[PDB]
Write a protein that binds this ligand. Structure first.
Ligand SMILES: C[C@@]12CCC[C@@](C)(C(=O)OP(=O)(O)OC[C@H]3O[C@@H](n4cnc5c(N)ncnc54)[C@H](O)[C@@H]3O)[C@H]1C[C@@H](O)[C@]13C[C@H]4C[C@H](O[C@@]4(C)C1)[C@@H]23
Ligand SMILES: C[C@@]12CCC[C@@](C)(C(=O)OP(=O)(O)OC[C@H]3O[C@@H](n4cnc5c(N)ncnc54)[C@H](O)[C@@H]3O)[C@H]1C[C@@H](O)[C@]13C[C@H]4C[C@H](O[C@@]4(C)C1)[C@@H]23
Ligand code: NA
Ligand code: NA
Lengths: 520, 520
């Protein structure tokens, strides 16, 4: 069975002259990339990394993320792409939970957060640390570490069901879980995406989405890699730099949400820079004729506007309106390599039209979460992965995604789980309880809002509650407003009544049948 | 991991009212098909079929072949789709070699061959035999056997690497070998084909190629099944019926090799039906402008003219000009899920430009042949599948298929090995020795020719040698001409000097650098 390592082994032979990666001045053909991967694998193995061992990336997007995944993959090891946006306590939690043998970290932009995180681990910090964006000769730097390795391919027999990429998600408990994506997961996801988006060796994809998110890997980093196209890296999304890279690298695809598109168009207008090679998937109307609207099924089906269903744990958008033709349901049908059933609370399959939990089996279902044996045993019960999302089958057999069962928010293209924010706010000594909801954002999706019950005789303002979150959770997770109450609404059972909180405090816009996709 | 049974389980839910299969008056929706498959699996299991057990189909194309593959697949058993064109000695050999628990047979057009074969087996005939084209109530019939089974899905956990389809090929020794194709083999083949041919739920594919050969399954039976298109069955190519089905069922594709096309075209000039919906991939010029020339990657690239490389043992056409763009080499490059190396006789990879044996690893490599321990250990040596075909890598990274190492002929895409034909001819009492070569034929690529040395003072004509072959080997393998000679030129080691035979008797048209594809 094919592994990620085999993809690079074949491309170095079949596409010796083609450029595989561009990241600033760095440009690598398939053979140059595979050589670097082999040296890197050499040094990892010399550091004691082998099957089932673990590397953490703490940085923005880099070509080195692809090198590390491939190198680790050739050893049967796995790479966690941590989020550069995480606050120190989140980064510390991920480091302790994942327990990596190696941490590859970035100084630019996040040095302070990285330092505070390392400091906090104290003597529990057993990992080796390499700075990726170091001076070339830095002996604790990635490039020197890589250079010391030998050119030979490790040539190991790696089982492609081995986890190779780990993406933290699913923080419904207040703490994130690391989704284990195997070589086979990624290859099956990439294969389906190649049909969905008509990807081939001429594809040139700008990696302008966060590598912490499954979306950038699915659309279209991994299919581009699989088909031997060019992956162009950008560290962060800055409209001008994106525009220049679209032109300079003749990109055919990019991961760009509607606000960024509008910034690029405004900036490019009447400058004569030709963006016509770009196949616009998201908000194609905003490009004003500067791009070519994508003709692939991804865009024509409505999948690019949110007509589909998935999650990290299914290797991304695994159900779409592109599979199986016209769909009465909002999400369409499963791609090949996944089967789906909507199950009631007793684990019996729901009838047509009846809401239940979306469950799945097949090649794109992940291996489970890192270090969560009981969660895995429970969410895989009866041999089906339980998504925690609600859906139904329509009479035409298509699927409708109705909403979450976890009160998850989406805000500014991030997921926010209420318990992460609630736990943070409740750490405050003045706060007895906090409930977090989402309210409609003026453009798309939600803003975070907290409803707070103060301790008796304590007093703290809305702004103090918000600012309290700054050192503790990612910036995008903070409430944008806070309401105060003497008590939170309760159901008959004494559970928090989140429906009543939404009704009384302006909640709405949650992911589901009324709010699908990236917006406009 | 996804299995063949999962495809049916998913389509019964996702496409409740869509037609999956058409065969004469039989029309089955996805749920109707899966129900029948479940009853069939029940009856198979009740007769003692389980994991690793074997069913032989000895019939022409039928909807029941798909039913049997899926039902066997749900039990972890396997189906051999035998050649209905086999002569009795070949059919007998395959039955003894394959040793099936159950044989499903057809009366129409082949009853005499089947009866002769069964007689030859005598008391070695241990299998149960079911007539598929029986009267409905026939208790030795497929329909009554199926109807006794229950509707419950067996819901067994089947390993996708289990063989599920067995196709006889590779008769270099003079006797065929059963290539073991798994669920995973077929699913990877089909996913790649859907990309190659732009296959989707609107595909209506006429199964006019013999299901005993990998061609019909790859192009496009399995991808059509996988993407929930409609599979229309015809038992074999009868020109008038093919014409009628293309029209009535609004077919978009069909497996029609060059010799079949002109008569279909001729008969449609009488009717004036528009065949524009048919996307002709093979020899589109022969359609005289009635069909549309397919514009999928498969046809635009030249792959549909033979620019590719593969074999049944690689799940079909695994290397093609559609993978990876323009290619100096005649075969293009490997599809995803296959890695290819050209190896020298010592097992070292060949330099660029150096001829060697094409060897392969990956998801589309078969599980080996049935009951061929020694051949399998040799052909899988050093962890690569050895194809026996010669090729080389070009400087641009692409692959060239140079030719066979077995003197094999290939006529309208059917392999014909000289030993098969030579051995049959030499059984004639008047024949002392025979050598078989191929001669060019534009429409068939090449024709079988025999060069025969008669026994002294015995006599036999060309026609007589040809007719001698009819009871002994499949029709398509017979010589189309016989030359008589006083002696065969010999090599130093005593083998036939085939190069001298080709030069003397107009030999050519062999598959490889000089002739690709099925004809024109
Ligand atoms: C990010 C994705 C690609 C990866 C999967 C997915 C669902 C994702 O968010 O993965 P996630 O981060 O793991 O979140 C999964 C959770 O997200 C929810 N969800 C499930 N389906 C949807 C839906 N259709 N719209 C909104 N929300 C959805 C469910 O609660 C699910 O459990 C989509 C959302 C989709 O909207 C877009 C936005 C952009 C980018 C990418 O391509 C797009 C043009 C479409 C694509
Ligand atoms: C049948 C196939 C599809 C399945 C694989 C293959 C190779 C097959 O027949 O498998 P097989 O019966 O197992 O035979 C394998 C042997 O066939 C030889 N071979 C390998 N590659 C080629 C070649 N390019 N042209 C001619 N012969 C070839 C090699 O000696 C090899 O070992 C091709 C032949 C190819 O010609 C065509 C004909 C039609 C239909 C289908 O699409 C086509 C437009 C192309 C396609
Ligand atoms: Na508190
Ligand atoms: Na003889």
């Amino acid at each position: 069975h094919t592994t990620i390592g085999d993809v690079l082994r074949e491309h170095r032979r079949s596409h010796p002259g083609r450029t595989a990666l561009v990241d600033g001045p760095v440009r690598l053909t398939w053979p140059e990339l595979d050589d670097r991967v082999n040296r890197l694998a050499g040094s990892l193995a010399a550091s004691g990394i082998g099957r089932g061992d673990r590397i953490m990336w703490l940085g923005q997007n880099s070509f080195r993320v692809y090198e590390l995944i491939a190198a680790a993959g050739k050893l049967g090891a796995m790479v966690c792409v941590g989020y550069w946006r995480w606050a120190p306590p989140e980064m510390e939690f991920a480091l302790r939970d994942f327990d990596p043998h190696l941490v590859v970290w970035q100084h630019q932009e996040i040095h302070e957060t990285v330092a505070r995180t390392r400091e906090a681990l104290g003597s529990d910090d057993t990992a080796r640390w390499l700075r990726h964006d170091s001076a070339p000769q830095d002996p604790d730097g990635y490039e020197a570490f890589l250079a010391a390795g030998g050119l030979a391919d490790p040539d190991l027999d790696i089982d492609p069901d081995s986890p190779v990429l780990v993406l933290y998600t699913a923080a419904m408990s207040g703490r994130q879980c690391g989704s284990l994506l195997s070589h086979t997961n990624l290859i099956a996801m990439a294969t389906a995406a190649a049909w969905l988006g008509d990807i081939d060796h001429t594809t040139a994809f700008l990696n302008s989405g966060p590598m912490f998110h499954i979306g950038n890997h699915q659309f279209w980093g991994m299919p581009t890699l699989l088909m031997a196209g060019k992956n162009v890296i950008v560290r962060r999304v800055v409209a001008e730099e994106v525009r220049d890279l679209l032109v300079a690298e003749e990109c055919t695809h990019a991961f760009l949400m509607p606000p960024t598109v509008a910034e690029i168009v405004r900036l490019n207008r009447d400058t004569g820079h030709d963006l016509s090679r770009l196949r616009a998937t998201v908000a194609p109307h905003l490009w004003e004729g500067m791009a070519t609207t994508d003709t692939s099924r991804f865009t024509r089906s409505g999948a690019a506007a949110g007509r589909g269903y998935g999650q990290t744990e299914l290797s991304g958008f695994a159900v779409t309106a592109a599979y199986g033709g016209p769909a009465a349901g909002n999400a369409g049908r499963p791609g090949p390599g996944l089967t789906v059933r909507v199950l009631d609370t007793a684990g019996r399959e729901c009838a047509v039209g009846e809401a239940g939990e979306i469950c799945a089996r097949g090649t794109v279902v992940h291996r489970g979460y890192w270090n969560r044996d009981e969660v895995n045993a429970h969410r895989f019960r009866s041999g089906w992965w339980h998504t925690t999302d609600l859906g139904r089958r329509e009479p035409d057999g298509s699927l409708t995604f109705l909403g979450t069962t976890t009160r998850m928010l989406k805000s500014a293209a991030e997921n926010i789980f209420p318990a992460e924010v609630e736990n943070c706010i409740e750490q405050h000594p003045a706060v007895r309880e906090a409930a977090v909801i989402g309210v409609p954002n003026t453009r798309w999706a939600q803003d975070v809002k907290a409803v707070v019950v103060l301790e008796p005789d304590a007093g703290v303002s809305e702004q103090e509650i918000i600012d309290h979150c700054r050192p503790r959770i990612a910036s995008y997770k903070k409430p944008k407003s806070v309401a105060f109450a003497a008590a939170l609404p309760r159901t008959v059972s004494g559970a928090r009544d989140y429906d009543a909180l939404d009704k009384e405090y302006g909640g709405g816009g949650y992911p589901g049948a009324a709010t699908l996709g990236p917006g406009r």
